Amino acid sequence: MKFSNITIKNFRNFEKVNINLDNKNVIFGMNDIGKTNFLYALRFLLDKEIRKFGFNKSDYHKHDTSKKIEIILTLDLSNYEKDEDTKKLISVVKGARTSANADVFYIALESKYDDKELYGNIILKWGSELDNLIDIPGRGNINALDNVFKVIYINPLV
Amino acid sequence: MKFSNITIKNFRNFEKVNINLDNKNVIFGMNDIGKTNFLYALRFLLDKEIRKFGFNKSDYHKHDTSKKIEIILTLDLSNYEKDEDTKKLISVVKGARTSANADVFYIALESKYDDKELYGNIILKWGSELDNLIDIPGRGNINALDNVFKVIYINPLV
Amino acid sequence: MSREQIIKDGGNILVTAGAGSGKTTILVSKIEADLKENKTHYSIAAVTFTNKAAKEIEGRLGYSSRGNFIGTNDGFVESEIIRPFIKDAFGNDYPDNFTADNQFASYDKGLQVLKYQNILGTYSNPKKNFKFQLALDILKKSLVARQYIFSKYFKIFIDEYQDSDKDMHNLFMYLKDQLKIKLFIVGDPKQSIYIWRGAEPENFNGLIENSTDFNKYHLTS
Amino acid sequence: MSREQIIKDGGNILVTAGAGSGKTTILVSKIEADLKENKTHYSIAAVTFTNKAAKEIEGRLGYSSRGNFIGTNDGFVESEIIRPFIKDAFGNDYPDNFTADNQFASYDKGLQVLKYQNILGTYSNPKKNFKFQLALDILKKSLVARQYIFSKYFKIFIDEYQDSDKDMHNLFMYLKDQLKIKLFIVGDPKQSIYIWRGAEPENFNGLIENSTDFNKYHLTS
């Protein structure tokens, strides 16, 4: 029904940032580098064609690959009765929810670097409780989260 | 220890082909299209950077996406005592083997087209018995089969 | 004939069809018509009594990325209601692991077996069902279970309703009334030879002779 | 001191170290040295008696894509020997599902519980072990189990050997002798206060006073 918050840690020039959200969001400022990295973090979390690749050594903050990248998004499911997107989410999620937490949901991203193979693997989790998340199931190249969200990217150039 | 055979069905210009193999293999002929598609099938089975993408509508035989692509490779594990590559394979596989079939192993690829999403998903299986195969486990973008095989591709151009 | 009046009807339907009528053909036609017509995220569930019919319908329908359930009514509860939401209704101690010898004649012993023994229970008396009463108990104690069931399916196809216990009727009617999910029932009144497994023919006949929100058709082909 | 003679030794080793010696430090140092030295596909297994020590060692070592087992000796068998290869030894009817109240006093009833009840068994007498005898039984009946164990690990680290039953000793010695896998044993002879759980201090003392293929060191720091 509603986007609420997003947290980003140890990703590019973000070290620990917490941003409140809504359905419509406008980002502006003079940095022009964090503004693009914000949308890249969103694409990594929700876009399968970007997440299809991994994380490089330059994707870690300060290029220190001994730290973990966390990106966590929060939703509000309060209008299940009046909304049909809440049903679209709830029909793919079954069991990861509890009744005491029937109005909040979490989608998380985690990455730890492999020094031997020089690769950063991305693993996704959801859950209602932030201290108990489980892997999103999937077969092959497809994910259960890919069945819900369609991310359309618009750019005048490229 | 030894490659034995490979079967390819409904993939590009291959309809039903069965080829016996060894460790060293040389392919020659005048077709020049099947010769490249042979190596592409090998890359799809064993290369994660090629399998990372899916199958298009042009990857199906006769462009008939109502048929299933199967690629199956066979190995011989007879020299476990004298070979160290048999141990490299056996240490990642644990349970998919049975004692009655302790000398033969299978690695398979299957794809069925999705007409609504216009995507061909690839799902891998191994097993000792060809009538009982199970999905290769993995987390995120990584597979248990990626821990064993390293595919080096050489081409004078590109 | 009336086979064209069914595909054009959307809602609660009965089909009182005898042996040799072609129940499978009309069921598959209705399923395909419903799937083609609807453009939403919802799915369908087809529940049968044997794995043979389930596999036949699975083969006839084909392949899709839309999540539809085709199988036996015993697998329906295990896959959708019990295994995912058992711990949300009773507690975290109740396990969701099971691979079903250990039958008893009480309901409490069924929970005891499921918990301590970690295997699905059963009943010695074939006139009572443990699966379909536990499923209804879970549905009435878990809000997320009802939410998932409502958000997931928009129609459920049921065949051979004459060979249904009272618990199956209770669960299906709870889904139809409290959750507002459509039903499609097909059955032969004079094929209750399975009464040795606790079948109650009274339910189908009562539905035929008393239901007011059900559309009724008969097939003589 | 002798702490430098251990890191330079590769093979079977004992470390008779008392309380306050720093067993964890030397264990982690040896593990890191072995991992850094070896460039093959093999791994190591660290078996403890508590989850606290397992987590401490896991945190100290760090992160790697190499598959090393760090945990309790009860989880070792379940993860490596029993769950994967139970059906290859006895049959396809024996289940690999379990979530472990239901303890008994016989081995056959333990198998019956595991099969019919679908839950891991136990013993009422603490002087006998069900897990570590079933594991050894499976190892002697499955060729693929032995093959995997040999192909997987090149060294196993064991701590607190004084609190070990006879079944644990039997399994570890089977691995050491029949499968030719190195062992690293650390234990305090005078810390058998856990004898209420069936601990047998005689095994560690016998190894110290009779072993001929074991290198022995003592730590006084």
Side-chain angles (χ1 to χ4, degrees):
Chain A
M1 180 65 206
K2 182 181 179 294
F3 295 94
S4 292
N5 191 76
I6 189 163
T7 309
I8 312 171
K9 309 182 227 185
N10 293 330
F11 178 70
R12 278 165 192 200
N13 48 355
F14 293 74
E15 199 209 316
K16 207 166 180 217
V17 192
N18 193 79
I19 306 159
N20 285 308
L21 302 179
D22 192 59
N23 285 351
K24 301 174 186 241
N25 307 280
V26 185
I27 192 170
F28 53 92
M30 190 166 172
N31 209 315
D32 293 333
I33 300 297
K35 278 162 69 211
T36 62
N37 288 342
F38 183 74
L39 295 192
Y40 274 114
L42 278 151
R43 292 180 89 189
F44 273 112
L45 193 61
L46 283 180
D47 200 8
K48 79 199 96 169
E49 298 298 327
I50 302 301
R51 203 203 315 122
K52 153 174 68 187
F53 312 81
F55 279 145
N56 297 314
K57 180 177 72 66
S58 53
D59 277 292
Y60 293 73
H61 182 57
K62 270 162 162 57
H63 288 221
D64 176 24
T65 46
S66 72
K67 295 169 318 195
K68 206 169 69 164
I69 300 174
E70 293 101 356
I71 297 158
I72 318 181
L73 175 84
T74 315
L75 315 162
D76 287 305
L77 310 175
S78 311
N79 285 14
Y80 157 79
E81 300 82 5
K82 281 164 71 174
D83 206 13
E84 280 276 317
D85 283 336
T86 301
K87 309 209 172 88
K88 288 184 190 140
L89 179 82
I90 284 164
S91 68
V92 190
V93 180
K94 48 163 300 197
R97 302 175 67 219
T98 58
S99 286
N101 290 301
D103 46 4
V104 75
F105 201 61
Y106 296 96
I107 299 166
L109 170 152
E110 307 101 351
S111 177
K112 188 76 92 165
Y113 196 71
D114 195 13
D115 219 333
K116 183 176 176 65
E117 313 287 321
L118 271 71
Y119 187 66
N121 199 29
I122 298 159
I123 300 155
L124 304 158
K125 310 192 164 202
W126 50 65
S128 294
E129 291 95 28
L130 198 48
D131 62 356
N132 192 238
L133 305 190
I134 56 153
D135 299 1
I136 306 161
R139 286 184 91 210
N141 301 321
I142 293 301
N143 214 24
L145 186 78
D146 305 347
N147 307 353
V148 192
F149 295 103
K150 172 76 192 93
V151 160
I152 294 181
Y153 183 70
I154 306 175
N155 207 327
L157 61 83
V158 178
Chain B
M1 180 64 206
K2 182 181 179 294
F3 295 94
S4 291
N5 191 77
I6 189 163
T7 309
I8 312 171
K9 308 182 227 185
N10 293 330
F11 178 70
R12 278 165 192 200
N13 48 355
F14 293 74
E15 198 209 316
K16 207 166 180 217
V17 192
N18 193 79
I19 306 159
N20 286 308
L21 302 179
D22 192 59
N23 285 351
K24 301 174 186 241
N25 307 280
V26 185
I27 192 170
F28 53 92
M30 190 166 172
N31 209 315
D32 293 333
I33 301 297
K35 278 163 69 211
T36 62
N37 288 342
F38 183 74
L39 295 192
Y40 274 114
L42 278 151
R43 292 180 89 189
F44 273 112
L45 193 61
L46 283 180
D47 200 8
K48 79 199 96 169
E49 298 298 327
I50 302 301
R51 203 203 315 122
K52 152 173 68 186
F53 312 81
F55 278 145
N56 296 315
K57 181 179 173 68
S58 52
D59 277 292
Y60 293 74
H61 182 57
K62 270 162 162 58
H63 288 221
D64 176 24
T65 47
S66 73
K67 295 170 318 195
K68 206 169 69 164
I69 300 174
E70 293 101 356
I71 297 158
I72 318 181
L73 175 84
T74 315
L75 315 162
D76 287 305
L77 310 175
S78 311
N79 285 14
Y80 157 79
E81 299 82 5
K82 281 164 71 174
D83 206 13
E84 280 276 317
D85 284 337
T86 302
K87 309 209 172 88
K88 288 184 190 140
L89 179 82
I90 284 164
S91 69
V92 190
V93 180
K94 49 163 300 197
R97 302 175 67 219
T98 58
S99 286
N101 290 301
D103 46 4
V104 75
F105 201 61
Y106 296 96
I107 299 166
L109 170 152
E110 307 101 351
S111 177
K112 188 76 92 165
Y113 196 71
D114 195 13
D115 219 333
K116 183 176 176 65
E117 313 287 321
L118 271 71
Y119 187 66
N121 199 29
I122 298 159
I123 300 155
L124 304 158
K125 310 192 164 202
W126 50 65
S128 294
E129 291 95 29
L130 198 48
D131 62 356
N132 192 238
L133 305 190
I134 56 153
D135 299 0
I136 306 161
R139 286 184 91 210
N141 301 321
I142 293 301
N143 214 24
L145 186 78
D146 305 348
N147 307 354
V148 192
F149 295 103
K150 172 76 192 93
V151 160
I152 294 181
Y153 183 70
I154 306 175
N155 207 327
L157 61 83
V158 177
Chain C
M1 67 297 288
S2 48
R3 286 188 152 196
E4 277 177 324
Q5 298 188 8
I6 280 155
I7 306 188
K8 205 172 65 175
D9 187 10
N12 301 345
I13 299 170
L14 269 73
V15 180
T16 306
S21 63
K23 300 169 170 58
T24 315
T25 289
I26 62 150
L27 206 74
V28 173
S29 278
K30 182 66 166 162
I31 288 161
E32 289 181 351
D34 280 330
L35 285 184
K36 188 264 182 185
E37 181 180 0
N38 192 6
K39 301 266 170 307
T40 48
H41 81 269
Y42 288 92
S43 287
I44 60 163
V47 292
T48 81
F49 265 54
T50 55
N51 289 337
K52 209 200 187 88
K55 185 60 64 65
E56 184 177 1
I57 299 166
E58 178 72 27
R60 289 187 183 179
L61 290 189
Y63 165 88
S64 69
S65 71
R66 197 185 208 157
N68 308 304
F69 172 81
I70 306 147
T72 314
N73 55 358
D74 272 338
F76 185 54
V77 288
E78 300 300 327
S79 177
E80 316 286 340
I81 308 173
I82 299 179
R83 190 185 291 274
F85 302 112
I86 187 174
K87 319 212 286 187
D88 192 57
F90 310 135
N92 269 279
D93 53 1
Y94 278 88
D96 64 23
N97 279 127
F98 48 94
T99 44
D101 54 0
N102 290 125
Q103 60 204 13
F104 197 66
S106 67
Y107 183 26
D108 289 328
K109 190 73 180 298
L111 293 93
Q112 292 174 15
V113 172
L114 192 51
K115 184 158 37 169
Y116 311 125
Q117 303 201 8
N118 189 179
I119 182 74
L120 206 70
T122 318
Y123 280 148
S124 296
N125 178 19
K127 288 189 285 289
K128 188 174 174 66
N129 219 326
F130 173 74
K131 273 195 215 205
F132 278 75
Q133 189 175 359
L134 187 68
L136 190 52
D137 215 351
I138 288 163
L139 270 175
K140 297 193 195 142
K141 293 173 168 48
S142 192
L143 161 75
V144 298
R146 313 190 295 261
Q147 275 176 359
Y148 164 74
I149 292 285
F150 190 71
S151 298
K152 179 57 184 195
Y153 301 111
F154 80 88
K155 199 183 279 288
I156 297 170
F157 297 88
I158 309 157
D159 74 343
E160 303 158 326
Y161 210 67
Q162 70 272 351
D163 300 324
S164 292
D165 311 339
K166 182 69 176 177
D167 304 341
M168 287 190 199
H169 194 85
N170 277 359
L171 180 63
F172 293 140
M173 288 301 125
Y174 181 90
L175 293 183
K176 195 202 74 65
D177 292 305
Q178 296 297 112
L179 290 194
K180 287 95 180 160
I181 285 152
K182 309 297 178 35
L183 295 182
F184 187 96
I185 292 146
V186 184
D188 183 16
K190 55 189 164 79
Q191 265 188 1
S192 311
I193 61 175
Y194 292 105
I195 196 163
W196 70 288
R197 286 204 162 177
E200 277 206 5
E202 285 72 7
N203 283 327
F204 193 34
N205 288 319
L207 266 181
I208 287 164
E209 286 140 9
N210 305 326
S211 52
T212 65
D213 49 3
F214 266 116
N215 267 344
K216 317 174 174 39
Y217 311 99
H218 199 315
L219 275 175
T220 79
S221 80
Chain D
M1 67 297 288
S2 48
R3 286 188 152 196
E4 277 177 324
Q5 298 188 8
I6 281 155
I7 306 188
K8 205 171 65 175
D9 187 10
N12 301 345
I13 298 170
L14 269 74
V15 180
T16 306
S21 64
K23 300 169 170 58
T24 307
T25 290
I26 61 149
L27 207 74
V28 173
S29 278
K30 182 66 166 162
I31 288 161
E32 289 181 351
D34 280 329
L35 285 184
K36 188 264 182 185
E37 180 180 0
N38 192 6
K39 301 266 170 307
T40 47
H41 80 269
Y42 288 92
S43 287
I44 60 163
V47 292
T48 81
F49 265 55
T50 55
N51 191 301
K52 209 200 186 88
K55 185 60 64 65
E56 184 177 1
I57 299 166
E58 178 72 26
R60 286 192 183 190
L61 290 189
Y63 165 88
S64 69
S65 71
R66 197 185 208 157
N68 308 304
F69 172 81
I70 306 147
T72 314
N73 55 359
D74 272 338
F76 185 54
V77 288
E78 299 300 327
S79 177
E80 316 286 340
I81 308 173
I82 299 179
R83 190 185 291 274
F85 302 112
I86 188 174
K87 319 212 286 187
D88 192 57
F90 310 135
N92 269 279
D93 53 1
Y94 278 88
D96 60 356
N97 279 127
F98 49 94
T99 45
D101 53 359
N102 288 125
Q103 61 203 14
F104 292 79
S106 81
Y107 184 32
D108 294 330
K109 191 63 175 288
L111 282 74
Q112 292 171 18
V113 171
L114 190 51
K115 184 158 37 169
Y116 310 125
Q117 302 200 7
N118 189 179
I119 182 75
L120 207 70
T122 300
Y123 282 146
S124 297
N125 178 19
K127 288 189 285 289
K128 187 159 72 75
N129 219 326
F130 173 74
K131 274 194 215 206
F132 278 75
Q133 189 175 359
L134 187 68
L136 190 52
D137 215 352
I138 288 163
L139 270 175
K140 297 193 195 142
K141 294 173 168 48
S142 192
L143 161 75
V144 298
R146 313 190 295 261
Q147 275 176 359
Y148 164 74
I149 292 285
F150 190 71
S151 298
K152 179 57 184 195
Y153 301 111
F154 80 88
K155 199 183 279 288
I156 297 170
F157 297 88
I158 309 157
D159 74 343
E160 303 158 326
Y161 210 67
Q162 70 272 351
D163 300 324
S164 292
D165 311 339
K166 182 69 176 177
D167 304 340
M168 291 192 198
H169 194 85
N170 277 359
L171 180 63
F172 293 140
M173 288 301 125
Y174 181 89
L175 293 183
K176 195 202 74 65
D177 292 305
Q178 296 297 112
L179 290 194
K180 287 95 180 160
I181 285 152
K182 309 297 178 35
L183 295 182
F184 187 96
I185 291 146
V186 184
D188 183 16
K190 55 189 164 80
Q191 265 188 1
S192 312
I193 61 175
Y194 292 105
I195 196 163
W196 71 288
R197 286 204 162 177
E200 277 206 5
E202 285 72 7
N203 283 328
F204 193 34
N205 288 319
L207 266 181
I208 287 164
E209 285 140 10
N210 304 326
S211 51
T212 65
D213 49 3
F214 266 117
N215 267 344
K216 317 174 174 39
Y217 311 99
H218 199 315
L219 275 174
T220 79
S221 80

